[PDB]
Amino acid sequence: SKIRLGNHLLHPETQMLNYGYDSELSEGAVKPPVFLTSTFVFKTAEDGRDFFDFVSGRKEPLVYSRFNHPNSEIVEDRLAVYEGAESAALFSSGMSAIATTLFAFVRPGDVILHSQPLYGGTETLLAKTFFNFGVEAVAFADGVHEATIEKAAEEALAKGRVSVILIETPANPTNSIVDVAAVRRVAEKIEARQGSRPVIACDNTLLGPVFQKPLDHGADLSVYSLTKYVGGHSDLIAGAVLGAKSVVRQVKALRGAIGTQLDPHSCWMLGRSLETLGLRMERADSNARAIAEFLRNHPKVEKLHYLPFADERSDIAALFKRQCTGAGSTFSFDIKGGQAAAFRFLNALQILKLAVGTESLASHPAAVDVRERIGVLESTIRLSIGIEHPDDLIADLAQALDA
Amino acid sequence: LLHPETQMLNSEIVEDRLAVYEGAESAALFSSGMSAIATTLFAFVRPGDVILHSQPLYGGTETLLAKTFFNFGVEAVAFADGVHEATIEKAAEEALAKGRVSVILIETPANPTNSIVDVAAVRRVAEKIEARQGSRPVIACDNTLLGPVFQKPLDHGADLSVYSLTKYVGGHSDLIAGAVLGAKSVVRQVKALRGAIGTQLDPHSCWMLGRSLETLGLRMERADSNARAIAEFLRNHPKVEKLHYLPFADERSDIAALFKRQCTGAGSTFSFDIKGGQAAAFRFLNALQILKLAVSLGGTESLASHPAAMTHSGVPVDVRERIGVLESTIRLSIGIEHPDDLIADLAQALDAA
Amino acid sequence: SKIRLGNHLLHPETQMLNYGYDSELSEGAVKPPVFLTSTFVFKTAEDGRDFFDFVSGRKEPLVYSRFNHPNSEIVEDRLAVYEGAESAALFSSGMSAIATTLFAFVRPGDVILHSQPLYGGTETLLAKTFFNFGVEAVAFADGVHEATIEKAAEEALAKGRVSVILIETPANPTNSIVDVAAVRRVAEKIEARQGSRPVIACDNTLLGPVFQKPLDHGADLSVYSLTKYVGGHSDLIAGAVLGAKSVVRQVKALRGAIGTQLDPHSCWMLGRSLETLGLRMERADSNARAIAEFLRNHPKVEKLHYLPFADERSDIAALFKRQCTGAGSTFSFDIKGGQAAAFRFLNALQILKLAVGTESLASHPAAVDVRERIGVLESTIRLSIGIEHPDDLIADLAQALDA
Amino acid sequence: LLHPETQMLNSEIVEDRLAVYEGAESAALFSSGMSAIATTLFAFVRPGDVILHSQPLYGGTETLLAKTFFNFGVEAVAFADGVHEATIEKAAEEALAKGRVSVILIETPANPTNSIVDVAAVRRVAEKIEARQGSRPVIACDNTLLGPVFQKPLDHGADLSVYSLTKYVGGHSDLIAGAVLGAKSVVRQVKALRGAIGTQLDPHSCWMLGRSLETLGLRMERADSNARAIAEFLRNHPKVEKLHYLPFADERSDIAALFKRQCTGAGSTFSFDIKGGQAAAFRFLNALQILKLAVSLGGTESLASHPAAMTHSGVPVDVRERIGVLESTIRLSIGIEHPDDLIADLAQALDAA
Ligand SMILES: *Cc1c(COP(=O)(O)O)cnc(C)c1O
Ligand SMILES: *Cc1c(COP(=O)(O)O)cnc(C)c1O
Ligand SMILES: *Cc1c(COP(=O)(O)O)cnc(C)c1O
Ligand SMILES: *Cc1c(COP(=O)(O)O)cnc(C)c1O
């Protein structure tokens, strides 16, 4: 399967259609009366001409059909293409990808060094299930600064062997971020004190694969819930892990032991979603930007947690600028008027829906010091922006802002 | 005023969404484009009728008229020039002479060279027919090529907007479907006949179409812009003789003026003529590595074919040459790949030609 | 694709798995770490041994996958195998199969000679849509006797050219039947008076393909709603037409003109249903027999319309005995006590469901001379028996019989 | 008393149906057999524990124990003879000596030669363990081979009945699933861990399994009777040395007596030894035209394989020979084809051997 056409290098959007294409064709007999069906493809122009000599009825009578049933291995290769990674493994869910990854690298006595906050399933996974297997966890709250990461890392090194550094960036809600390259420098030091480099696993669900590539900034694994945004549908549940071949091979071996792979039908559906990923992501992201501009300078908005509007001089702005190529579709704002106004705003929405991709959503993460440190107040509204028309989203936001 | 892309996020439910995208009052779904066409015709025609129609039509539609309807005592009269009211008028008079004109069946733009017909003109010709025979024919417009994003024929005089959704809306080779859109009462008549002859779209396909509609705006826009980029590249290529692409019609021609008033975009499908005849065409085709050799795969992947030796090989030469289908003509149907990959493929294949 | 293994001839149940099997395999690369997946098949034992040399990890590294995506042509060939027909065409529905069939053979001026009663969609198709294209219809009420068929046929020959004889046997409800061979003799005479033999199309939905094969008794086409019983699921809608190759080819040509073919996904689902057809049909039929024995001699049952219990000496019994190999799963009985008792019985059922395959169903066809001639009284209950345990069905029937 | 076949006509809904078929109080669905197994183990074991288990286990389960659980500080002790309480007892004592015995993991009958284990015996050994250590291990029985139709291990002392539904219940190569069945409170613990590690069965597969359950009784019965017919044919065939098929155990053996009390049928999978060693085995395999060469395709199609050179090639020879896996051993997994076609295929392939 080609990554080049002569000297020209193929882009990902092309590759979601072409990479492994030959392996998606089936053959059937040509039987009269001959009609062109929705699936027929021809190896050569002369083959097409011969087929239509039957269709025309000029001649009395093999034909290829292109269907969309890629193996898991081919959908993995396409993911890896999008990421710019060597290799990929698919999983039945985001949580099974994370769990299998942790099971492949940790042992009782170990410490998982991680960022904060993390997806709630990941926190409960570390706090209960891994704690019960003798695995400890130490958090760094501030992932922007190499110094705060270094500190937590000493705290971890004193509880035991650091076998994994687990980060999520940006994290939900409010998009605090971690400096992946700083995490990698700190892993090189950890390794000096202990004789092994921990595996750096980055939950890239929020911005990946289009707007952030953690493997290009020092991560060893880029991990996903493909359920959330890539898949584009609530009935498509999947996770993935991507990185270098030998590291991914170790997760695959664990994946086969514990049986966490993605089933073939879901692989087919994912192959179909990938076809429109670049379109869906780019629209979501442009929609989020237009909405962000509208909320900024809106009388009823206290604060916007939107990374492109961080101050030029801040460390956050500098990091975002070197680690990311876009802001994705998820962000938060604090409304003027606390809870009762936030609820009234929510209750008024007619286009954005209330829940917890594709469709635009609004939620209230609060529903005390922990929540405020994150920037989750009772005035806080989290928006996850889909692919509706931006004008229509903005209209709905204006009127709900009960204004 | 909500945009349709916003509103996309049962047969009955999907029909309602399609009606919203079209801006129509109601919609009926069918197992295929051809079944939508047939069911529509059988709802409206009876032995002794005449179907007046534009030219060229899709080949399945031609067969349907020439064979099946002809056997049921329904004749057909073509107009080759649907741009001018006067040529549409001449045809209608031939048709009135042969029987009751119950349907006017048009297809615009037409595959594979984007011939067009003036839907408002056809409507006026229909209102003359009504004056001269007592009843106004149903105007059905096969809007597959640009619809529903880039043309709304119900806004320009059609009574029904008819689709193969297989081609572009659905997105994939395994999703086949047809639709008929218009006023509840004209549509209701099509559904009754649907119920009788069992031409409904199956539920799973209705579900799959539902899903497809969510990305329809994005995919159509992208295919359209990929197509414009490719047409622009080809227009300057020294192995390309002629383009059949409506945005490139001279701003002063009647075609240009009609395109500007009836359409908001060119869609994904067009043709060009290569230098060096059929043998050059065939070498170009055989060197393609990204565009596949095919007629349709649902609209997501880009395809190339040779209409004179393939789809239009059974069409008489007078029709072919009138619409610009020559031995050097290549049809392209552009999907949503990166435009640079498509252009690089085209450029290397043109070097083989 | 094989119909024989050496000299041994393959049975249909085998063929639903094997016929076109090679065309259902896909190929993928063998990539480490190697695991056996749910889909792998091996061309040879040495190939299997080599694959597991990877799986065992003895060696570091092509493999075939068997999925179930048959072309429509292959599912058609499998149907034809079950029928003992040369050829088959698939359609989007039972009604599209019937309509396409009629459209392929009739023209304004023609008469459709048919049996009675017919499925309601077929009656409305003949009474409205074909009447409006100048096509007339003449019925024979008694399809057992060559004489009553002959009479209607004269009545038809006097209205115009008889191009189709359309029969449904057994018909719903009450399982009146038509003598297909008698219909064929009458078609040979029609042909003598007019110079063409009409096409004999037999709606075989009730007993086909296992318990009746109309093509073996003089029919030219065996036509189906595969929705009702073959498919085994309400979301699987399909029809078919089967017979000799040249006759089926004419229906296919019409099918391509009017676009009434069955879509690929439904073809796949049908391919899956066929795998269990022989099992489902044989259970349904044995269940119906056990239930029939129970209702017969049940105090509260007036009359049973069950073909195996027709009197030995009757023409009906003789016909059934030479035309059918079983009774299928659908029949009727008249309860003692008219409407109010029939309703009470229905309302009491807990296992059989009230509606209009796979699951057992009960309905009231009445809900006056037309209905009685058929043997649809207000006491009449129609049962369509599914694949539940016979003991459980009988239990539910006993108690509902409000007894 | 309703039969389960009657009651088959959300994850939650399908779980309830499976629980009815098993006769269990509750069920949890998983993405695979292996994920059902893993999730169960991780719900119950902690570092310092010992998993006592029967032998042979499925190869994925062996790996899971030998690698993953061993790395998490959980050791494992096997008993080779699960027919006799005394050998199960000896093993349990070895296990108590190494740590807390938290699970007893059994698999009966075992693939590919139908070794069996006495589930009531294991339960008594568990109650002795409880007396000697303070807590009674969870008994999990991998019932894939006969369940749920032909064995109910929860009726004979197991705490949990664990399945690869991929193998026989689901019916097809594209339906992979696992299950854990038992009391609501033991199951509830497995679901909590399921929620945490994300091992749930996807909705579409839950839907597909739903459908499969409707024909489960018919397909299992048919496979079982096809298998009995084939075993009967093979038993008299002059190129067949030995059968590994539980109905053919001597009515006086302990195996026979245990089979009669714990099982209601033999299911579809068994083995036989061919005369002429591996080279004859391989020629037999390569001549098959109806049975395919494979390990599993979901249970509908009949398959043949060579365990010593394929699935059990990594298993040490002492285990292999104890369970009767020899170079001459052929595994058959019988589907729902007509028995005459299968026997005709077997007979012609045996002539090549
Ligand atoms: C949802 C989510 C997960 C877990 O994904 P599932 O597919 O639902 O198991 C992990 N990480 C992040 C950031 C998430 O949003
Ligand atoms: C393909 C096509 C049809 C027929 O649609 P099907 O879905 O293939 O039956 C009708 N009209 C036009 C213009 C087409 O391109
Ligand atoms: C239902 C039925 C039909 C029509 O079938 P559809 O698949 O529902 O279009 C035709 N004949 C008979 C006997 C029927 O029961
Ligand atoms: C296949 C199998 C497993 C594993 O099931 P998967 O669904 O393939 O993960 C477990 N136990 C037994 C006995 C098996 O045969």
Q: What would your notes on this structure say?
A:
Four copies of one chain form a homotetramer. Chain A has 403 residues and is an alpha/beta fold. Chain A folds into two domains: 1-277, Type I PLP-dependent aspartate aminotransferase-like (Major domain) (Aspartate Aminotransferase, domain 2), CATH 3.40.640; 278-403, Alpha-Beta Complex (Aspartate Aminotransferase, domain 1), CATH 3.90.1150. Chain A has helices at 12-18, 45-55, 72-83, 94-105, 120-130, 146-159, 180-194, 245-258, 264-274, 277-295, 315-323, 338-348, 369-374, 390-400, and strands spanning 4-5, 8-9, 25-28, 40-41, 63-66, 87-91, 111-115, 136-140, 162-168, 199-203, 221-225, 239-243, 301-305, 330-335, 353-354, 361-363, 380-384. In chain A, the strands form four sheets. Chain A has a seven-stranded mixed sheet, with helices on both faces. Chain A has a five-stranded mixed sheet with strand order 13-14-17-16-15. In chain A, helix 4 packs across helix 8 (245-258). The radius of gyration of chain A is 24 Å and the shape is globular. Chain A binds chain D through residues 91-99, 103, 107-108, 121, 124-125, 128-129, 132-134, 235, 237, 239, 254, 256-261, 263-266, and chain D through 30-38, 42, 46-47, 60, 63-64, 67-68, 71-73, 174, 176, 178, 193, 196-200, 202-205, 208. The structure holds pyridoxal-5'-phosphate (4 copies). The site of one pyridoxal-5'-phosphate has 13 residues of chain A, from helix 4. Chains A, C: Its cofactor is pyridoxal 5'-phosphate. Chains A, C: Keywords: Pyridoxal phosphate, Transferase. Chains A, C: InterPro entries: Cys/Met-Metab_PyrdxlP-dep_enz, Cys_met_metab_PP, PyrdxlP-dep_Trfase, PyrdxlP-dep_Trfase_major, PyrdxlP-dep_Trfase_small. Chains A, C: It holds the Pfam family Cys_Met_Meta_PP. Chains A, C: One of its GO terms (molecular function) is carbon-sulfur lyase activity.
